[PDB]
């Protein structure tokens, strides 16, 4: 076995309410689903997968993909690293 990923420390910071994550794509219709399931923020959706989406109730798939897609972009961002962006320069 190999363990490593396990480490990311959750925090209200750099985080958004599941509601906002859905309203951003107009999928707030799954608010009661995520809430009841036990998902308040997007982060909590770190252990979520299409399988779970279609499980919670999500009948239509076309929506599932749209939900996960964003989650991937968001979650990926969720980081506790400083801002580092430089312009055109060699040395």
Swiss-Prot record:
Record domain SAM: where:
13-77
Give disulfide pairs as residue numbers. none
Q: Which residues form a coiled coil?
A: none
Tissue expression remark: Detected in brain, thymus, lymph node, thyroid, spinal cord, trachea, heart, skeletal muscle, spleen, kidney, liver, placenta, lung and peripheral blood leukocytes.
Q: Where in the cell is it found?
A: Cytoplasm
- Highest taxon, organism lineage: Eukaryota
Name of the protein this chain belongs to: Arf-GAP with Rho-GAP domain, ANK repeat and PH domain-containing protein 2
What role is this protein assigned? Phosphatidylinositol 3,4,5-trisphosphate-dependent GTPase-activating protein that modulates actin cytoskeleton remodeling by regulating ARF and RHO family members. Is activated by phosphatidylinositol 3,4,5-trisphosphate (PtdIns(3,4,5)P3) binding. Can be activated by phosphatidylinositol 3,4-bisphosphate (PtdIns(3,4,5)P2) binding, albeit with lower efficiency.
Q: Which residues carry this modification: Phosphotyrosine?
A: 84
